[PDB]
């Protein structure tokens, strides 16, 4: 007496070449190295010689 309780959600549209969803896991496969928060405040820099002069 099995019954098919069809759910609310529409059937998920098949992934295409253009959509980066197929690359999404690849991004997690990449796990690119991020960068720490740069701790510079710019208040102690004085613009008379801190700017390059060559």
């Amino acid at each position: 007496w099995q019954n098919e309780v069809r759910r609310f959600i529409p059937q998920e549209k098949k992934l295409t070449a253009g959509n980066p969803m197929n690359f999404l896991g690849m991004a997690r496969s990449i796990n690119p190295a991020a960068n720490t928060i740069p701790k510079v405040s710019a208040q102690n820099i004085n613009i008379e010689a801190s700017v390059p002069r060559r």
Partner: protein, 160 residues
């Protein structure tokens, strides 16, 4: 100056200045005191406003000063501070002119090519000039906020 723009338009039309132009320069000359006050206030408080807006730009866009960005290295962040100084001085020049011609022809026309050659993220500079806008609005009077914000909006839109 709006006087130069009106003269240019009249010469292009080969006609003397119309009543609209005459009223325009009349309002400009009668209201020159406010523009001079804005210029003096910006010149006096330039060093603090530029530093604060640069700090807020860093807070929005830390990657610009991350190890590998255009602003990374104290030389390469002091150069951002100098560039913001240049743009603030250009805005001050425009405020005392009544039009955006000096802004257009000193730092706006051909800015994209310069920042492509140097590799600077021009959108980051747009955010920086925006932050200059909020800082100037904070330090400066409410009614003059519209006048200063008009020029800041023009610079942001053209250079965005």
């Amino acid at each position: 100056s709006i006087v130069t723009k009106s003269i240019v338009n009249a010469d292009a039309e080969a006609r003397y200045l119309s009543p609209g132009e005459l009223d325009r320069i009349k309002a400009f000359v009668t209201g020159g005191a406010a523009r001079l006050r804005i210029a003096e206030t910006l010149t006096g408080s330039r060093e603090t406003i530029v530093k604060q807006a640069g700090d807020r730009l860093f807070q929005k866009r830390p990657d610009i000063v991350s190890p590998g960005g255009n602003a990374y290295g104290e030389e390469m962040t002091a150069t951002c501070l100098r560039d913001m100084d240049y743009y603030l001085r250009l805005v001050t020049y425009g405020v005392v002119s009544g039009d955006v011609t000096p802004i257009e022809e000193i730092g706006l026309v051909g800015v994209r090519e310069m920042y492509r050659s140097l590799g600077t993220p021009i959108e980051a500079v747009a955010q920086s000039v925006r932050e200059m806008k909020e800082v100037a609005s904070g330090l400066m009077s409410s009614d003059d906020a519209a006048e200063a914000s008009a020029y800041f909006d023009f610079v942001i839109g053209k250079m965005s």
